[PDB]
Design a protein around this nucleic acid. Sequence first.
DNA 1: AGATAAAC
DNA 2: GTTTATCT
Length: 60
Amino acid sequence: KRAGTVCSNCQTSTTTLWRRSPMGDPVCNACGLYYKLHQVNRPLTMRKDGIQTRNRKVSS
DNA sequence: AGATAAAC
DNA sequence: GTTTATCT
């Protein structure tokens, strides 16, 4: 079902938080957050073919 | 979903 | 300084 949702801002098919834009533009959360960071576009030079990950927040 | 805090 | 992914 979620498969096919290509991020309208970085064409990524795998995202950690699929955010749906009111106008009708499914954009991976990363594109949404970056947009607020500078209230401008969001370069997808950090995206890849698989969701990136790192030392997840310690499960305190 | 949204927020946080961590990590680069 | 900045950004994103994971957590709740």
